[PDB]
Design a protein around this ligand. Sequence first.
Ligand SMILES: COc1ccc2nnn(CC(=O)N(Cc3ccccn3)c3ccc(C4CCNCC4)cc3)c2c1
Ligand SMILES: COc1ccc2nnn(CC(=O)N(Cc3ccccn3)c3ccc(C4CCNCC4)cc3)c2c1
Lengths: 304, 304
Amino acid sequence: SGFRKMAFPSGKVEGCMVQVTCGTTTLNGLWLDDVVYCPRHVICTSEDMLNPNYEDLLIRKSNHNFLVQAGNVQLRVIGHSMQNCVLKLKVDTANPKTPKYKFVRIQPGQTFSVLACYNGSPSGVYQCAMRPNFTIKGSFLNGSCGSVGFNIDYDCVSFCYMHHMELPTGVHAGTDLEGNFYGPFVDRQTAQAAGTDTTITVNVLAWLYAAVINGDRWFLNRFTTTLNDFNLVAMKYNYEPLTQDHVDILGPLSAQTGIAVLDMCASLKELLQNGMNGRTILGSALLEDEFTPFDVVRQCSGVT
Amino acid sequence: SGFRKMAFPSGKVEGCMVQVTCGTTTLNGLWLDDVVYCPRHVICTSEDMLNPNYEDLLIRKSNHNFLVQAGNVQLRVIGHSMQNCVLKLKVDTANPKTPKYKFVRIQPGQTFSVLACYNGSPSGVYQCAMRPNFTIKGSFLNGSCGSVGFNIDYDCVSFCYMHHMELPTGVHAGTDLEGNFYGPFVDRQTAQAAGTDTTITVNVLAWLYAAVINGDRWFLNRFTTTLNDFNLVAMKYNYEPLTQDHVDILGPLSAQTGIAVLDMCASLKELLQNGMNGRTILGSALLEDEFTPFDVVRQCSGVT
Ligand SMILES: COc1ccc2nnn(CC(=O)N(Cc3ccccn3)c3ccc(C4CCNCC4)cc3)c2c1
Ligand SMILES: COc1ccc2nnn(CC(=O)N(Cc3ccccn3)c3ccc(C4CCNCC4)cc3)c2c1
């Protein structure tokens, strides 16, 4: 028993982290096979980060201007190309530590682990969710760019995120591994609206089921609701509308606990309307939305 | 910016995890150099877990009864011994992946990362604190025994914890790497009192400083207090008494923010007496105590 904000074991990703330097800018890259992936803003100075013309900036760069270091050893760059907002530096050596991997573009509301890195060196690992508004609430300082987000299924690492920037609001934005930003964000130092964020309803319900499994049951009530009635409450509290697809994904947890999904929605409705009254659920005084139904089942079944 | 419950990168520890089987019991072991460390209750059946005589049980076991597997390869056990509540299985092969390591006995209130494992395979990593009452609030299912807690300083892993049991209350108990339990716990399936837990005051203050650094400042007030006045409030709210040693450890954060430690105590005093009034600090609706002052400085300075 017990429920924690658990990250995937990071070893397979630690073996891919490298340092990429271009001019006076240093950030992290991801070395998979014979390619190193990093944010294209590695080619920017502070005088052009306000409005960079990446095509023009990259033209002034040659393979020898990209310094790639894996621990203490230097990699030889034999090709460079820009794909969307990422640079792909072809190197003459395949990473011997390359795990089985995929590049995936996650959906908003899905979770992943972030391995924060500085100068190609791992500093820490944490779990987070891609917000409905396509930002992440991470922990990133200057130099963390190029740190990646990922999920692991047995021996396969699915890379879903590469860190590119911190918005003036302090939230984080980045791309998939093809260099496509999540959300409307551009890699420019300009004011950028993230838009209204909402609470990931299906994840809050999944966490409520995790709470019941682990003994926190005070919030269970004698009520039920309908999807339409529940969604009227969800709209008022800036929660994502719950769909039958969400109810279907909650199926295993509903079956395990014997608590019908609409009954759990009624518990959530009462928690939204009444608050916690100074009580806690799984050590939290707020409704947690960073665990998907898959995460709750994985953590509750001990999947390795 | 941003503040997260960050765990250390787990790769160095993942390379040490092995599966240990004895009879019909399977749990995790830690392979460092030519020794595998695991909880001694690996030799117990369910008929004797109620009151085991470990000395008598171990006498009926030989080197060949301890099956140790590192991934797909079997290790040859050439010696076995019991040290307190851990077994040390000498193997004929030194772990090629053994990092630089130390065994340390952490103090209550200190933090560490746990790499939860099942059948010698890593499932997840999370950060936690050793409670003042020497329990940990982890996430452990059957088979997780032998999973370890650790801290990392550059290239050195300091192992501080090995998981042994879940108390009937759902909290977790274990040992240092010499097999000495933290707290009064015994490795028996009996009722065991954990004792009164308290909030780690120095960690809450460290987290309040982390909040100020990251912009959450609403809780700062026009008041100050004394150590004696603050400790009267701490006693009433089951917080650990703050000492000058704690004030001294908060020095760097007090210097960085320009907020005197006793002024931050006055903010904490008002938060204890008035509550959060429906507000949050670093995304939390309660006062967080699982970040030490060292952790706040590390996370805020990007130490790798
Ligand atoms: C300063 O504190 C942080 C904290 C967390 C951070 N996460 N990401 N970033 C980076 C970031 O947002 N930008 C803005 C931006 C502008 C243009 C393109 C893309 N992004 C950025 C990018 C590059 C540079 C380099 C210029 C040349 N000299 C070396 C730094 C400086 C800032 C962080 C910065
Ligand atoms: C069942 O769910 C959990 C969940 C989280 C858990 N963390 N730890 N433990 C293990 C645990 O507390 N005990 C109690 C105990 C008794 C004696 C000595 C030490 N500890 C335990 C130990 C060994 C065995 C084995 C007997 C032979 N068959 C294979 C299991 C069974 C339970 C967990 C169990």
